[PDB]
């Protein structure tokens with residue numbers, strides 16, 4: 001019934017037994033003397049010279065007695081004030097080429113220092129403001145920014161960091177959510193979040209325990225001062241080998257709290273940042289005191305950024321909907337709508353109704369695929385993507401203001417995760433991280449694999465690309481290998497005569513076009529390689545269209561028209577059986593479906609070669625509304641990119657994701673066909689556009705690193721997503737494409753293909769390339 005000698009113990013305790021641990025306050029379970037014994041604060045957190053050599057007083061928050069080093073409970077500045085040592089931050093950067101750990105350490109510990117709402121740009125404040133953090137950043141490995149997941153809220157991003165999973169897979173899809181199977185709601189405040197039923201995946205602290213690596217408790221009741229959290233981690237590090245954890249986590253609620261109150265830009269943000277730096281300094285001073293400052297790996301990481309948002313920039317559903325009292329809204333920097341009613345009516349009422357409307361409604365299946373925010377029963381079908389700096393609310397009455405008329409907050413977050421203000425920080429420091437090294441920005445889903453590597457753990461299955469972050473680490477125990485191709489292509493010659501085709505249609509070396517090798521098909525299927533003067537394709541005899549079409553456009557390439565006599569021309573391909581070709585009469589009978597081509601006739605190298613572009617094996621089903629988008633991309637944008645990037649290689653193709661799980665559909669999952677036909681209708685079309693990062697070299701003669709931009713365009717029968725679509729395509733199509741930017745890895749998941757298999761680059765480098773997102 002007493003916490004004597006068990007303050008912040010690692011041994012778990014059950015009810016009704018009173019507890020003395022990190023979370024006993026959060027479970028209303030602390031022993032009567034927890035606050036007295038474990039939350040001491042007398043004399044503060046810093047030794048002073050007058051305290052050096054004191055007789056131990058068990059009342060003090062920390063100790064400066066000669067016995068404190070053996071007891072493991074000195075104040076973090078004890079050796080500086082009492083033994084003449086230097087603060088860690090005052091010491092010169094020295095490379096840590098191998099760990100320097102006490103005998104009996106079996107691995108270098110990992111300490112995760114997480115900060116809430118730490119915007120990437122805050123790092124541009126001085127060593128003046130954050131000298132300890134700046135030394136970690138400059139001496140260790142850092143990225144200019146780390147990209148959070150959507151929504152850019154605390155619980156989804158912390159749990160993604162811990163699991164390597166998109167929120168739709170780990171289940172924490174918001175700070176609040178409703179689960180219809182549970183018939184219950186989850187909120188940041190309250191006891192519901194403590195129920196294990198909500199939490200999927202396998203977080204780092206569980207992966208470690210299952211594999212025999214002890215974790216310190218990652219979570220801290222708000223009642224525990226930051227200084228005491230640091231001292232507790234330092235005390236655990238002095239435990240004996242059979243008890244000492246290998247992995248630890250510190251969490252700070254700052255700078256998120258002051259960011260909400262004052263916004264991200266005020267001078268008021270300086271002192272919160274100074275206080276975080278002071279806490280980092282206590283940790284590093286304390287590690288140096290224990291001679292562990294060249295043994296431990298430290299990660300300084302944020303969950304999301306912070307944007308300028310005031311209650312004066314709020315859109316109200318009551319200005320759009322006939323009755324907002326038959327709906328429930330998750331409001332704020334995003335919107336989720338459910339019935340408290342008809343979805344199609346609601347979407348229409350929210351679509352391009354006011355000139356500068358500051359949100360856009362989506363059925364969740366139509367959200368940009370890069371958000372990976374659909375495949376979970378907790379994600380409402382109706383979603384509102386809110387413009388940065390804005391809020392959406394149900395009615396004007398939901399906006400609260402002070403008596404003076406000013407809002408209660410000036411900052412918020414939650415927006416689209418490619419928004420610059422939502423980016424956050426990553427620094428890694430220690431023997432296993434690289435020395436004085438800058439790495440490209442990366443997504444927070446990748447970090448779980450790295451933390452597993454740092455601890456010698458086998459990661460649970462996750463959404464990271466293991467290997468894509470090897471360049472962060474000085475020593476790699478994981479070496480990725482390219483997946484073996486599952487299906488091998490056929491190379492069919494001239495097989496049939498034109499007169500053998502049914503078929504409804506009427507019409508009046510490959511060193512150049514496959515620059516990085518043939519894509520590997522990673523599932524069983526039947527497909528043909530087809531060569532042409534201007535493009536190469538892998539044609540699926542199962543889906544009756546190419547899985548991929550590859551072609552290279554030089555800087556000097558000319559765009560030409562489709563001659564009038566060829567406007568409706570479609571030609572049989574004598575290499576491919578009539579039984580494995582599309583049927584032109586199907587498109588005539590489908591009044592709502594037209595077709596387009598994957599290699600564009602506009603980019604043919606000659607009038608003779610243009611006929612190849614009209615082969616039935618180059619044709620794909622396209623809604624007339626989508627053809628406006630695709631024709632502009634094909635006729636205008638490809639040439640633009642080629643002219644800007646010193647040539648481009650393009651790989652385009654279809655995607656089928658009817659169950660919106662981000663993975664290629666099986667034939668049985670396809671829910672729409674061209675009417676009366678076996679021709680499946682894609683849900684999306686992709687394109688991957690590659691050139692030389694060194695733009696002084698043409699795309700086809702690139703010696704070094706590659707540059708890539710890709711897209712996954714929704715194949716929709718209207719352009720309701722584009723409020724300016726009544727105008728010329730030059731006014732809206734490129735904005736649509738930028739919203740639907742994607743990683744090559746995203747396309748690989750959705751197609752079952754593997755790209756960049758034949759290059760001069762290391763596989764590690766290619767994995768980094770495949771996880772790149774061009775954000776615009």
Ligand SMILES: CC(C)CCC[C@@H](C)[C@H]1CC[C@H]2[C@@H]3[C@H](O)C=C4C[C@@H](O)CC[C@]4(C)[C@H]3CC[C@]12C
Nearest residue numbers: 026193194196199200202203206219220221222
């Ligand atoms: C009130 C705050 C200060 C702290 C709230 C912490 C709460 C979210 C934490 C406390 C214990 C956590 C669970 C615990 O680690 C057991 C697991 C196993 C894992 O397999 C799934 C996650 C889960 C349920 C943790 C979820 C987060 C919890 C509830």
Ligand SMILES: *[C@@H]1O[C@H](CO)[C@@H](O[C@@H]2O[C@H](CO)[C@@H](O)[C@H](O)[C@H]2NC(C)=O)[C@H](O)[C@H]1NC(C)=O
Nearest residue numbers: 165166169200201372461462463661662663749
């Ligand atoms: C993200 O990672 C998860 C975990 O590996 C993937 O979900 C797994 O998907 C397989 C294949 O469908 C299922 O058998 C498992 O049940 C899933 N596990 C979990 C925990 O979700 C998911 O497909 C990945 N997402 C993307 C877009 O690739």
Ligand SMILES: CCCCCc1cc(O)c2c(c1)OC(C)(C)[C@@H]1CC[C@@H](C)C[C@H]21
Nearest residue numbers: 112155158159161162204218219249251
């Ligand atoms: C995996 C390495 C990086 C971070 C680990 C970590 C530490 C945490 O403290 C928390 C994490 C994650 O995620 C959840 C559980 C959603 C939390 C919700 C409440 C907050 C007060 C603290 C929490």
Ligand SMILES: [Ca+2]
Nearest residue numbers: 657663664665
């Ligand atoms: Ca699918």
Ligand SMILES: [Zn+2]
Nearest residue numbers: 116117154303
């Ligand atoms: Zn947060």
Ligand SMILES: [Zn+2]
Nearest residue numbers: 117256260413
């Ligand atoms: Zn916040």
